[PDB]
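Quarterly update, task 2.4: chloride ion-bound model.
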Amino acid sequence: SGFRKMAFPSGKVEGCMVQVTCGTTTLNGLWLDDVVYCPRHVICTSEDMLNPNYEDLLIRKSNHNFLVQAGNVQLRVIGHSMQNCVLKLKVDTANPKTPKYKFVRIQPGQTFSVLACYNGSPSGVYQCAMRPNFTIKGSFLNGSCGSVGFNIDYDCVSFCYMHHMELPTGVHAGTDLEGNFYGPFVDRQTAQAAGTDTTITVNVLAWLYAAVINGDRWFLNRFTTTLNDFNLVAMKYNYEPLTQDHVDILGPLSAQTGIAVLDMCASLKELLQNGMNGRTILGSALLEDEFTPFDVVRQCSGVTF
Amino acid sequence: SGFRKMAFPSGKVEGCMVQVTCGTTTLNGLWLDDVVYCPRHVICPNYEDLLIRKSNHNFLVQAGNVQLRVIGHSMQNCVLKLKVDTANPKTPKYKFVRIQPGQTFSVLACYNGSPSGVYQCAMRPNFTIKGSFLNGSCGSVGFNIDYDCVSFCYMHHMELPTGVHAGTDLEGNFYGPFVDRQTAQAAGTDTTITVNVLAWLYAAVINGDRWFLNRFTTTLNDFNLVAMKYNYEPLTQDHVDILGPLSAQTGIAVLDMCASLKELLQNGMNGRTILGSALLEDEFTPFDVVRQCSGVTF
Ligand SMILES: N#CCNC(=O)CN1Cc2ccc(Cl)cc2[C@H](C(=O)Nc2cncc3ccccc23)C1
Ligand SMILES: [Cl-]
């Protein structure tokens, strides 16, 4: 019993964290085999960030301008190349602690663990979701750039995010491990604002099924809804549209609890209308949207209470 | 910016997790040097009588794909200590410490000696933890990290009827009036960790959330009379002293913040949130706030 925001064990990722210094800038790098991956803005000054020409800044650099530190050992850089917004530093030593891994690009609504690092040293781990506006509501300070997001289903680490920047509203933006940004963001200090954020509907529904599995049904009603009627209501509360794919994905949880997806949708409609009336759902007074259908199935018991 | 329930990096603890099987029971063990620590209920009660019948070969210990050979066994309170023939080469620098209610820690939830998740939690005033554990989670451990040293503070033993969890320190002493057996055991009425709510209100101020601040202050006694009424733990002078650094950083005295907390208790949030929460959060200590709003590394 119980339901917590659970992160994956960070050990496999901790063994890959290094410190990258280029001039006066120091940030984090990911050391996998003989390559260190880090944000390309490590080659920038603060002044450069307004309108940086990364190709012009990079051509003026040699291998020995990049200092890479793994614990107390200095790694020797023997090559460098840029792939989108990430710098790839070829080092002379392969990481003996390289886990089995893949680079995966995630979609909004997907969750992942973040190992927040400073000076190549991990300081904390927390669970996140890629928001619909492509930002993450993280906890990052200056020096955290290069910190990574990941999932560890089975024994393989799937790296999905690398931290690049903080936006004016306190939220964060970054890239996949191929250097492609999530969202319409640039690694430039320009007028960049996160688009209006919305609630991840399929995740709130999954969390309502997790509440039913843990023995709570006070929020259920005797009504059902069409998919279109649900979306017309939910759009009024800044909720993401629920698609047929979302309904299909919620299939297993519907069969486990005996509550049809559109009947759970009717219950969500009523919660949006009434609020909780001093009650909580899984210890929360707000509707939780950072647990996917897959996270609920992984954490919760296979037997409904 | 941002404020998340952050756990310590779990790597140093992951390298210590093993699977312990005794008969039909399978649970988790902590392998440090040549000793595996696990809940004594793995032998299940008269624990001296059940243990005397057991031999070393009755205990199967598995570390990854390798079977460890048990060469000795002894009991310390509610913890079984299995002497193995191999020292853990991944043993970190460590201490066994007993925590107080209100203090927080990270939990590496494990099943079959394999870590599956990590989460942060607090020891409640009623000595239970609001964890997320399923059957097979027994032997999962709680810890904190200071520089390079792992301080083990909790080992999971059981789930109570209300869904909350009970366990021991690494010396086998239970937190709370609990026993390791099947009987009528219930968690006592819980209270809110006042010093932690105040720390979280300072974290909100640091992150730019000040709507709850007012021009008023309060005496410690007046605040405590109000706290006793909302099932909040009494705030002591030690708590006020511990909140000293956060008070100097934000310019808001502790009894000034206590006047804000009194108003939030008597009038609610009025449809507003604090750090994305509609409830007053009590599972972040003053030290956790200082650490997360300063970037301390391990
Ligand atoms: N608003 C705002 C923050 N902007 C700055 O104070 C300077 N930053 C400009 C800038 C512009 C673009 C890019 Cl790609 C990178 C950067 C860098 C950046 O965003 N780093 C940071 C990442 N995460 C958390 C942080 C918290 C506090 C301070 C800096 C953080 C430094
Ligand atoms: Cl995805």
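Highlight for this quarter: The longest helix of chain B spans residues 254-267.
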